[PDB]
Amino acid sequence: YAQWVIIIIHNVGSQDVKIKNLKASWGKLHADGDKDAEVSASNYEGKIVKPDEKLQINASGRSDAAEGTTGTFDLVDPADGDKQVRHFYWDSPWGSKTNTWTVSGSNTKWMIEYSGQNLDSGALGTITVDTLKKG
Ligand code: NA
């Protein structure tokens, strides 16, 4: 449980954004403040984050294995036929390997800002992702 991430998507613009394809390849997804309460990625599939709302994802390594947390998701634009906005990848591996947080993709109608990631040894930490559809 030393390897964990909290990802907070904050819609700071005026247009809805949508999450799809959340998947942890290592570790689990869990409820806020509750690593023992696992949650399904399907609870997030297609969820809309409205203006000024936040959506929180919590992921951690396994309780009974030397396994960190790794995963991906996409943000898409529900006003534009779920057009891809950005792809996201996280990795907080068990052991000495540094952490990774990677945002990728091109959709010039959107601005995406993130901060909080710990790229050194230890947990990736709490990453806030602000989203804004440009006017
Ligand atoms: Na690590």
What's the 125 CA to ligand 1 centre distance in angstroms?
A: 10
What's the 126 CA to ligand 1 centre distance in angstroms?
A: 14
Domains of the chain (ranges, CATH numbers): 1-135 (2.60.270.50)
What's the 16 CA to ligand 1 centre distance in angstroms?
A: 33
Please provide the size of the chain in residues.
Answer: 135
Give the determination technique: X-ray
Go through 104-135 and write b for each residue having 16 or more CB atoms within 10 A of its CB, e for each that does not.
Answer: eeebeebebebeebbeeeebbebbbbbbbbee
Q: How many CB atoms lie within 10 A of CB 48?
A: 12
**Which two structure tokens, joined as six digits, stand for 84?**
């891809």
Q: How many CB atoms lie within 10 A of CB 86?
A: 19
Taking alpha carbons only, the member of 61, 89, 53 closest to residue 74 is 89
State the resolution, in angstroms.
Answer: 1.3
Cα end-to-end span (Å), the chain: 42
CB 127 within 8 A of CB 114: yes
**Which two structure tokens, joined as six digits, stand for 94?**
């068990």
Question: Phi, psi (5° rounding) for residue 60?
Answer: -145, 165
Determine the Cα–Cα distance for residues 34 and 124; give it in Å rounded to an integer: 17
Determine the Cα–Cα distance for residues 68 and 4; give it in Å rounded to an integer: 7
